[PDB]
Amino acid sequence: SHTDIKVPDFSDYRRPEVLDSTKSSKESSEARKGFSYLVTATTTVGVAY
Amino acid sequence: AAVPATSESPVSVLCRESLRGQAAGRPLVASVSLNVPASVRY
Amino acid sequence: AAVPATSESPVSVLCRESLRGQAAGRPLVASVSLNVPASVRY
Amino acid sequence: WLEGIRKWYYNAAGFNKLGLMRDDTIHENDDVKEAIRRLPENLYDDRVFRIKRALDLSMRQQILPKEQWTKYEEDKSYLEPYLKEVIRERKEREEWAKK
Amino acid sequence: EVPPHPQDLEFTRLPNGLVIASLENYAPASRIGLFIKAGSRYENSNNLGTSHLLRLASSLTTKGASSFKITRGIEAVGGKLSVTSTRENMAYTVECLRDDVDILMEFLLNVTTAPEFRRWEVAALQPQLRIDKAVALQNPQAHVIENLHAAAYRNALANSLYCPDYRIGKVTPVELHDYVQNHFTSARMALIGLGVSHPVLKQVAEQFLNIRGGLLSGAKAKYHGGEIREQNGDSLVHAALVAESAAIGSAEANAFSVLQHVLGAGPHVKRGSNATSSLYQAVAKGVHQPFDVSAFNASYSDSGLFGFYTISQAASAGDVIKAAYNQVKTIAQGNLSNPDVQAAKNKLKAGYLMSVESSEGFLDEVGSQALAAGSYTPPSTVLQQIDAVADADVINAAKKFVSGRKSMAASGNLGHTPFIDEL
Amino acid sequence: KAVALQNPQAHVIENLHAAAYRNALANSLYCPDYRIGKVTPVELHDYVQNHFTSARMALIGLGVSHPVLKQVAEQFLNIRGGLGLSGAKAKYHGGEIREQNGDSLVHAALVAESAAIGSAEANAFSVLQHVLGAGPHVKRGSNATS
Amino acid sequence: TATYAQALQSVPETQVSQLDNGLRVASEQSSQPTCTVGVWIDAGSRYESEKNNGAGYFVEHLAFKGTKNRPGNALEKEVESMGAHLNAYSTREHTAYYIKALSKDLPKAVELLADIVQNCSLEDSQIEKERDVILQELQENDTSMRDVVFNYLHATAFQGTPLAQSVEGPSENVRKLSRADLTEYLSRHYKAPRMVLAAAGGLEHRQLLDLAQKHFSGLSGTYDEDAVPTLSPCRFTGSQICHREDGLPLAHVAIAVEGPGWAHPDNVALQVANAIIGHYDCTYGGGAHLSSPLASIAATNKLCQSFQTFNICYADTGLLGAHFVCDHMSIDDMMFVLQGQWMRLCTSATESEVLRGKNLLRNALVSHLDGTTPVCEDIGRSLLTYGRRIPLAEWESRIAEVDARVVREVCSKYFYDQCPAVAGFGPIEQLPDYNRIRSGMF
Numbered sequence A: 001s002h003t004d005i006k007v008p009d010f011s012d013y014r015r016p017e018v019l020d021s022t023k024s025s026k027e028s029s030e031a032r033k034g035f036s037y038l039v040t041a042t043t044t045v046g047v048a049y
Numbered sequence B, C: 001a002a003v004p005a006t007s008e009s010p011v012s013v014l015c016r017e018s019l020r021g022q023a024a025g026r027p028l029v030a031s032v033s034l035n036v037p038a039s040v041r042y
Numbered sequence D: 001w002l003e004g005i006r007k008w009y010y011n012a013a014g015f016n017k018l019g020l021m022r023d024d025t026i027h028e029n030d031d032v033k034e035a036i037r038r039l040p041e042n043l044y045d046d047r048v049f050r051i052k053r054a055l056d057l058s059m060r061q062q063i064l065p066k067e068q069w070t071k072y073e074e075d076k077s078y079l080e081p082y083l084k085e086v087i088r089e090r091k092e093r094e095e096w097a098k099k
Numbered sequence E: 001e002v003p004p005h006p007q008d009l010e011f012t013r014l015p016n017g018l019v020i021a022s023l024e025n026y027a028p029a030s031r032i033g034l035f036i037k038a039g040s041r042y043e044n045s046n047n048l049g050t051s052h053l054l055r056l057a058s059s060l061t062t063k064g065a066s067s068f069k070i071t072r073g074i075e076a077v078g079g080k081l082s083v084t085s086t087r088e089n090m091a092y093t094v095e096c097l098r099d100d101v102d103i104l105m106e107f108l109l110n111v112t113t114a115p116e117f118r119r120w121e122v123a124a125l126q127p128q129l130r131i132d133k134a135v136a137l138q139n140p141q142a143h144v145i146e147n148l149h150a151a152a153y154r155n156a157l158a159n160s161l162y163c164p165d166y167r168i169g170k171v172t173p174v175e176l177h178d179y180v181q182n183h184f185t186s187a188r189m190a191l192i193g194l195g196v197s198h199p200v201l202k203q204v205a206e207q208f209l210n211i212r213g214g215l216l217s218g219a220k221a222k223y224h225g226g227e228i229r230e231q232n233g234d235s236l237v238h239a240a241l242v243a244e245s246a247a248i249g250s251a252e253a254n255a256f257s258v259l260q261h262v263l264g265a266g267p268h269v270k271r272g273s274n275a276t277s278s279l280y281q282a283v284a285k286g287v288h289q290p291f292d293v294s295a296f297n298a299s300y301s302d303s304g305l306f307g308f309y310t311i312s313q314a315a316s317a318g319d320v321i322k323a324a325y326n327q328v329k330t331i332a333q334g335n336l337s338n339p340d341v342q343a344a345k346n347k348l349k350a351g352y353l354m355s356v357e358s359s360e361g362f363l364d365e366v367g368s369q370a371l372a373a374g375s376y377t378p379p380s381t382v383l384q385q386i387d388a389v390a391d392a393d394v395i396n397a398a399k400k401f402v403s404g405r406k407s408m409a410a411s412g413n414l415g416h417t418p419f420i421d422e423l
Numbered sequence F: 001k002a003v004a005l006q007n008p009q010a011h012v013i014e015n016l017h018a019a020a021y022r023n024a025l026a027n028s029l030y031c032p033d034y035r036i037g038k039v040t041p042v043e044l045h046d047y048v049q050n051h052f053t054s055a056r057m058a059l060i061g062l063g064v065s066h067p068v069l070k071q072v073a074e075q076f077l078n079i080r081g082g083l084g085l086s087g088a089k090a091k092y093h094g095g096e097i098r099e100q101n102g103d104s105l106v107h108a109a110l111v112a113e114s115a116a117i118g119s120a121e122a123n124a125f126s127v128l129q130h131v132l133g134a135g136p137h138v139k140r141g142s143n144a145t146s
Numbered sequence G: 001t002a003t004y005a006q007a008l009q010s011v012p013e014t015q016v017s018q019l020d021n022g023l024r025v026a027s028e029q030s031s032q033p034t035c036t037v038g039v040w041i042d043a044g045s046r047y048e049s050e051k052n053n054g055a056g057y058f059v060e061h062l063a064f065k066g067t068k069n070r071p072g073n074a075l076e077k078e079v080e081s082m083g084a085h086l087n088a089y090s091t092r093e094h095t096a097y098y099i100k101a102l103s104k105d106l107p108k109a110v111e112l113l114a115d116i117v118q119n120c121s122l123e124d125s126q127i128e129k130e131r132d133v134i135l136q137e138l139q140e141n142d143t144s145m146r147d148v149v150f151n152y153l154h155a156t157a158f159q160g161t162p163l164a165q166s167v168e169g170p171s172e173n174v175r176k177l178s179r180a181d182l183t184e185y186l187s188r189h190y191k192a193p194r195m196v197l198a199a200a201g202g203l204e205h206r207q208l209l210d211l212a213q214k215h216f217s218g219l220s221g222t223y224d225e226d227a228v229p230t231l232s233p234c235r236f237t238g239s240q241i242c243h244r245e246d247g248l249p250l251a252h253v254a255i256a257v258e259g260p261g262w263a264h265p266d267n268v269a270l271q272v273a274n275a276i277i278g279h280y281d282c283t284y285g286g287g288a289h290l291s292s293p294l295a296s297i298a299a300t301n302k303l304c305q306s307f308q309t310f311n312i313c314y315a316d317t318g319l320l321g322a323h324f325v326c327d328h329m330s331i332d333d334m335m336f337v338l339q340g341q342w343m344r345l346c347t348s349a350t351e352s353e354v355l356r357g358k359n360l361l362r363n364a365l366v367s368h369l370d371g372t373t374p375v376c377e378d379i380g381r382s383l384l385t386y387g388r389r390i391p392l393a394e395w396e397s398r399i400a401e402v403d404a405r406v407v408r409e410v411c412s413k414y415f416y417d418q419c420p421a422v423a424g425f426g427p428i429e430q431l432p433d434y435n436r437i438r439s440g441m442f
């Protein structure tokens, strides 16, 4: 059955803030996007220079 | 209309339970809509 | 073989004269060839 | 003399010398293309032939014998009813597009 | 809590024959339907499929509203416009909030009394006939029911609700204009409304639905009998066996309706064994592969078809069919308990009442009654008539079936599907 | 199939046989549409092993010597499984199939069961056929004797 | 004859009472000579562990196979002989059993529901028979690309949580589930405070309540304190699950962002937004003229066979998005236009398209509550989800207050630069890469 299909465990790859399956990940989304986008903005600043 | 049809069209049975109700019992009726999937009853 | 069929196929009558002979009279026969157009008689 | 100058203009324009009717000479924009697509077989086929005949004369830098020129008084707008509706339909859509 | 209602249905027949019926239920939304005697039975061999394309053309340009406007205007208010056809009628129905009924009514009037059937719009629509038909035909039942009517009748009711393949792309603007002028006339129409005032509804009909001419004519449907077999390999065979029964409205029709429920006319319990389905139990006794069976009842203005429909694995078709038939035979021989007839009546009565509890189900019933009998018969009376059917009448309806000339249609791998003369 | 079916006669003769018989002779010379693309290699191997057997064949030759032809058959046409998976009697049933399609001209065939080929009765039917009229004899003629 | 607003007040307010064991009894009285009455329970696969996942679904197969008072097909014969209909359904959070019958038959109907809900037999041999029926239904469901794709959507969006589970359960569970598992499950979940006896039709609340007291009084109002099954929130994961199968003729794709949950006010505006984008299928008469840009583009350019937006709600989360069915060469175009539409609503919804959405929603709400069954269900489910029946006049107020600004702000909040969950099945070589899908969210 297609119901025998379960997503493999990704805990070894998850950022720590989304490791608890009993917690909302929205609580950390802005922090996670902020981190990656900060890497992008800084890079763009260095390139502009 | 606002309500989507029971089954959206595009272009199953393996048990006696899922087969019950498949036999027709009344004359056919065909429907066409502006906003809703077409249907054919019976 | 060497002889092409009377009518090559690809994918009416307006008078009695041209219609005479159109009615079937015998069982059907279907032919297929390596070198010749297929045919169906009767 | 406006009607007087009109017949004068019609002959000066000269599309009649190639056997064309005024509507055969309209600039084709999307409204016109839709109107031509809407024409009944006979009007469409006639139009095609008149244009083809005119392009042929133009290539030979020739014109038709005067007795074959489209006559001012017989030229009629076969395209107008179709084009007018196509334009009306587009306007209606444009009005609706404003909220 | 305490509901305001319940008001009564109001009925009016205008001098021109048009019937106007409505019920102000104070609902937030309104439902208006224009019922017409224009179903496929009115097509002849020269214009087959015309009413099907017509059914698909409700959105084309009209004298008072462009195709674009009909769609945008109805959608702007969140409304609906739909066309439902049966072999006998066509129902144009609109739905919207009650404050927008003037908008919907106007579009409905334009679609049914002022369609333009523009040559280019009609041409562009032809392809939809293929899509609409293929979608419907994915259901084997559609194949079988359509073939059954073609096999049973010589004309009229023999016509399919779907356009014949050879006619797709060939239905002309002229055939559409003539079909509308021939059948969309006052003497052939019924305007039904829910959540609307009768005076308003009536006034609308008087001002915009006075269409004279056309034909209230129509050749009787000639029951013929015969069989159509569609070999196609499916592991499951779908089959229907019937005989001519009775015209809707007649008293005999009520006996057939009762016979249908005695026999078994559809499930009552999710995944149940259909303990009280006479036909189902008989088949279950003899066959042990999956299957389904049900009595089949179709009643029309001048005729009717009654019998049973079966679905079984290909190798067991004959066993299932003969078993179902033998079971109807026992009924015809008088073997029928009064309790079973009472159970049947209970099913029929409850089924009827449940069928008209939704606005949609109610409208269809009123609309159908308005055209078939130019009158309205309330539930109370229907139940009475159902009660009035006697066990003898049931046994007799069953006899008529058994001795009547049959009509049959089956589709699937028919290697083991019996012909009528083997039953 | 489409090429063969451009001839209305093919439509009619095929339907007439489907209407006349319950089986066997009821089968069409052309593959049913639903089966196109579904005929398997296995069904073809099986059909050949079931019917292309010595007891079901006849090797005919023109402009060839009989001994040679005979020797060929003996060496290469001794196919067992012979007599193969034969069929059953064709059960005449009777009935009608109507194909509405709008052509200005209607093609129709009406028949009844006659006789198996070979029998004497078959010869009477063959004579009756010519008494009735079985095809033209003169280009553009009026069929005076039909 | 009244106006739309006036008619909303025409609606009989829904009556609610509670038995001592805590069972809620609610009804809406009409003049209908028929009615629908049933029991809605706060039980579903979201409450199941991996070990008993499928239990509720299994119970559904047993519910009508016989009770202690009416063994075997007895219950069946009784429902059938009075012309009534008995149905059931199980979702990830709710389970319902309901009967459609003549109003005069309400007492017997309530007695039967009570008998079903407390004295179901669960016969060992019945259980074994149902194993095979469930296994065949699992094979049938495998052929429903839409059911497969939506179960896949839940599996990845809510991976690692109870919401990732299908309602039916894995085939191995169906093979192993024992009667003991089923009774343990029913024991812990079928408690008076988690159930609602709902009825709609020609009946009075007082009679309903008296029948409740009469037949459901002995219903347990206490498992104890060691059981009280309580739901923890379920983490949503931006992710993708692609089941490539080029052998299937059309591709099915479902994409969604995390939704707010049942009780959130934001659901009204999201519903308006979803109505603006709408639904569509090849049989729609509208075509090029449809109001929804996604629908007109789709129809004129033949981008899909169909599509539908959706807003699936759960206690404190949900799936907000759309599903579409198309040719293998149209997946990218569909995704492009769909995301463009979400983006356009976040930044540029217009007052007129929003009014259209509001009107579509109003019509959908009122036309859905047509008939005793839909109203009965709205009563039962609403008491469980909102804790009360929200009247049409209230929905109207909530709808009326939505305008273009609100639509932009609520859409931006849930769609804008948020990670979606994506499920694909069929010839999906052209389904865009997740990064590309993620960049389409801004």
Ligand SMILES: CCCCCCO[C@@H]1O[C@H](CO)[C@@H](O)[C@H](O)[C@H]1O
Residues within 6 Å of the ligand: D034, D086, D089, D090, D093, E059, E060, E061, E066, E067, E068, E120, E121, E122, E124, E125, G287
């Ligand atoms: C599928 C059959 C066609 C449906 C009728 C709509 O037809 C369309 O109306 C438009 C006006 O809004 C025109 O601009 C367009 O050229 C025309 O094809």
Ligand SMILES: CCCCCCO[C@@H]1O[C@H](CO)[C@@H](O)[C@H](O)[C@H]1O
Residues within 6 Å of the ligand: G265, G390, G391, G393, G394, G395, G397, G398, G401
């Ligand atoms: C921010 C939410 C908008 C406020 C909507 C409240 O709306 C009110 O709810 C009451 C309770 O059912 C109803 O009785 C009343 O008719 C309705 O207008």
